[PDB]
Design a protein around this ligand. Structure first.
Ligand SMILES: O=c1ccn([C@@H]2O[C@H](COP(=O)(O)OP(=O)(O)O[C@H]3O[C@H](CO)[C@@H](O)[C@H](O)[C@H]3O)[C@@H](O)[C@H]2O)c(=O)[nH]1
Ligand SMILES: O=c1ccn([C@@H]2O[C@H](COP(=O)(O)OP(=O)(O)O[C@H]3O[C@H](CO)[C@@H](O)[C@H](O)[C@H]3O)[C@@H](O)[C@H]2O)c(=O)[nH]1
Ligand SMILES: O=c1ccn([C@@H]2O[C@H](COP(=O)(O)OP(=O)(O)O[C@H]3O[C@H](CO)[C@@H](O)[C@H](O)[C@H]3O)[C@@H](O)[C@H]2O)c(=O)[nH]1
Ligand SMILES: O=c1ccn([C@@H]2O[C@H](COP(=O)(O)OP(=O)(O)O[C@H]3O[C@H](CO)[C@@H](O)[C@H](O)[C@H]3O)[C@@H](O)[C@H]2O)c(=O)[nH]1
Lengths: 289, 289, 289, 289
């Protein structure tokens, strides 16, 4: 089956970004011209995923809802589920078991920002994988900061270590994940780690250990914009701004993606743009049609 | 009577920034490493003002209160009041009458950032004017946008015009305002302008027609950033970040303002830094004391 | 045949970038960590092209030689020709006639900065195209600044206009081109245009009339860093930096490409890195091997 | 007497910035919209100094002359001398001994960028000091790297140390020194230090041990950018860029300084602007008069 459901893990308090996030949820902070959640949500839309569950902290969930709704406007089917406390990625599958049912499900952090060429192609194998899982590896300067995927001499992936003190490779596990229906049970049988969290790395290690973990390599031609500090945040906004302004196009603009992927027709775009004739975002949607 | 009372009109829908303001108050968005509101708040602090009224919309008013509280943490006394609808900056005095009372009151916009080493020396005067009011003019390329103030060959002021179609100067009146008790009654008498608003410029002009209006100039060392559009929003954040990383310091840091001005002591700083100690913002305060 | 000859047109007085280009030539301006010319050269290399002809101004040409030499160090055959005057892009073929010979040759401007995933596959068709020519279309915000390609209802490129007043599309022709042997005589027969230049558009036109012009589409996932203004040079620099500093990888590092594509081996890397062992770039090299 | 002479030391192999400096002198590199050297040179001009000697490497000195000429175009008197090898700052005076004669002379490093409104007012005292020296201190989190000056509980130049392992304070001595005429004789007497050089901190000690050393403190309203590495260079570049487009003013623009201090008139400005008009640099000056 084609992975047609996804979950956006937009929780966390964002203590890392205080006092900024103290006022507004990180996934809501604007990345140049749109709230962060738009980027990873766009990534799901690029994979053909319409049925998406957005999980946010009890405080922010109503906020996101205010911004996206049932996503009906963009041919999407948005649903919301609250996560009482940030206890690890893997819990997203528990927090949304009922949502997944017996279908394959992709997962993506709400602060996972991607930019690059064949993004859909890149996710194609992951979206069409019958059983198993797919994670995406990216070359970073600070491997220890992420889950590192080790590589032998042949090439394929042979292991996965979460924030190792001595990374076996410079490739990190990005915030985009794809699992089959079996992730739910894994998550439910998973035990917390030292930092008391249900580590997605444990779930990935389980797939790999069964020879069912595909690691999609992401070359230096793709950009995985970090959003862990105030610095990276502006560098991310400028990056995206640099690209959009030069292109006259937007990156990760859900309305457009919805429109170009035929989730909504031209009339639908106008109805959405109509009220927003002020800001440039509206004029952009209008011009796009 | 030193002006010991200031009002921050941080309301309005700020739609010009959609969708980054759909579920987030414009005044809550960040400027690099802190929320926007943090800036105009520090501005009043630098003026020695500690009794501040935070005006805003019913939806957003409680939010700032959530992030800011009463201000006691920063030796301040924050008070909030709701504005049923954006009827003009001047309504800030009608809505904050009980607040002002008989005392001189300052009004600073919740979305206006003010940078400038000597900016404090400059306000000190405004806070010491016995009667009348004081405005701060800044040289901008888009005079037509803001409010403009004309100056004779003697450098003195002569006329004020709200968004002149044909500007008589490049010096626009920033959202920093220092008034005396006569302002409250001035607002009450004001009639709705063309755009059905109580223009703050009508107040200012009145003082001028009475020679009770000073105009502090913001030389080549000042900076009055805009925050109406996405570009200006990131542009402003880029400024703060740049200057903050280079000149080694924090711009409009309420904590630093509080400690540096004896509003709070060293110990109280280390206490505020804690929830903030995962990034520079907090680690800075820790190193300051 | 496979296009194995390249011409990097790094001429120009750079008047537009004064006084920056008054001191150093544009193509030598640093794009963060390496000189500009290094990016296009890297593009040619990634295309497999090792025999290159650098065409620069009488004044700058030598600066490039001191910088690159015969290129033998990177397994490249770098030759130099002097363009007395910027008579046009097409002139790059007249100056490199003897260089081109009966072989196909690619053209790349010294300020053409390309970044994105799969740069080689994007150019593969061009490299192997038996005959004809291949250019690239990229959606930009200011088409009138470039040669605009027009597409019919089916989406097939059918027209090409140079800096038109009313762009028939938003897709501009990039600074990377691939032509067959017939480009030389084609160019040698071009007459000056309004701006008295041997327009590369005319050349491409000829190929298109004949149906020998492939217009490869360069998607929004690639970045075509602008280098027209000081503002775009710094953004281009920031862009490149945000990518490198995140992956711990360099974008457009000749030594690396040379080493990766086997143009040179590990030992040669040591020798090339030897003298620079006292600097970041040199460390990047050693760390590579 | 007022210090009317100054030396801009602009030598060095620049190997730190390879390969951007391989074919370009570091001091010729751009800092956003103008050549680096335009900064230190602007510092001197703001200090009233008009007669300046530019010392560079034998190969590089020419490129500076080709760029600045005799400097008469800006009302300056530019003279050039050569430094066969980088034996130290102090050597500048042995080189420029014939240029200095019997007058006080200032020194500025070619690659030093100073920013600050009060900068002129500050240097004023340095130029008017009857005898002695005037160094400039700035707060740097990386003292060990530079020359560090010590301040007793009172706040004076109690101790000077060149790149001390154990910084005796976080105040570094910038690259702008104002000496009296006795410095020349000091230089010629200095002896090679550990790194076989003629240390400037040594010459500075002499003045200190004579109670003749003044220390101009550069508060937080100042910014002394670094340009030693690729990262620093781009940072320094984002700095200037942001303050100009934000504050609407060019930073360290010789033409403007020349016109502001009446070294040149508007007629000359327009003529200078001509070649530079193809961009804001020209337009600015044209608009400035
Ligand atoms: O219960 C939770 C846990 C996390 N988060 C959010 O998830 C995002 C993930 O960021 P972060 O917490 O810093 O990721 P880590 O937990 O440090 O690591 C996981 O996410 C990384 C993605 O960069 C992977 O590299 C690692 O292998 C994986 O273990 C953040 O915005 C978090 O607030 C939630 O919303 N709820
Ligand atoms: O009742 C109101 C009206 C406005 N605003 C806020 O004020 C900010 C300023 O923007 P805007 O309302 O469009 O400014 P203007 O009201 O058009 O102009 C006023 O504010 C300018 C400063 O930008 C001054 O230059 C002008 O002289 C002054 O008349 C915004 O975030 C608004 O939401 C409120 O909070 N409440
Ligand atoms: O009068 C001139 C002409 C060219 N050059 C040099 O030649 C190269 C060309 O740059 P530029 O003048 O800006 O390109 P255009 O001539 O305006 O346009 C050509 O290059 C564009 C971008 O690659 C294409 O879109 C167009 O179709 C093609 O005609 C550069 O290195 C320039 O410095 C000059 O210095 N002066
Ligand atoms: O004979 C020489 C020595 C240096 N330089 C140049 O001076 C600049 C300054 O950098 P560097 O040589 O590394 O400065 P240091 O020698 O490390 O230190 C000196 O310059 C510092 C400011 O950067 C001061 O704080 C110190 O007290 C002073 O001793 C560079 O572009 C050098 O190439 C020359 O041109 N000629």
């Amino acid at each position: 089956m084609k992975t047609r459901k996804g979950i956006i893990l937009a929780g966390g308090s964002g203590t890392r970004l205080y006092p900024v996030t103290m006022a507004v949820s990180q996934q809501l902070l604007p990345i140049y011209d749109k709230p962060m959640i738009y980027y990873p949500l766009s990534t799901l839309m690029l994979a053909g995923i319409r049925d998406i569950l957005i999980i946010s902290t009890p405080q922010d969930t109503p906020r996101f809802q205010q911004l996206l709704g049932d996503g009906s406007q963009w041919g999407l089917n948005l649903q919301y589920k609250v996560q009482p406390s940030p206890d690890g990625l893997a819990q997203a599958f528990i927090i949304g078991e009922e949502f997944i049912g017996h279908d394959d499900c992709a997962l993506v952090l709400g602060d996972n920002i991607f930019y690059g060429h064949d993004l859909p192609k890149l996710m194609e194998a992951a979206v069409n994988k019958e059983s198993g899982a797919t994670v995406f590896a990216y070359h970073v300067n600070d491997p220890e900061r992420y889950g590192v995927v080790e590589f032998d001499q042949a090439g394929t992936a042979v292991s996965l270590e979460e924030k190792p003190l001595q990374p076996k490779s410079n490739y990190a596990v990005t915030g985009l994940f794809f699992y089959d229906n079996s992730v739910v049970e894994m998550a439910k049988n998973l035990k917390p780690s030292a930092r008391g969290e249900l580590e997605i790395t444990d779930i990935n290690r389980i797939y790999m250990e069964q020879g069912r973990l595909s690691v999609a390599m992401m070359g230096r031609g793709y950009a995985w914009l970090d959003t862990g500090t105030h610095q990276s945040l502006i560098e991310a906004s400028n990056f995206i701004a640099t690209i959009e302004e030069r292109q006259g196009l937007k990156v990760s603009c859900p309305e457009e993606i919805a429109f170009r992927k035929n989730f909504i027709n031209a009339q639908q775009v106008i109805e959405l743009a109509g009220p927003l004739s002020k800001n440039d975002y509206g004029k952009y949607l209008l011009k796009m049609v």
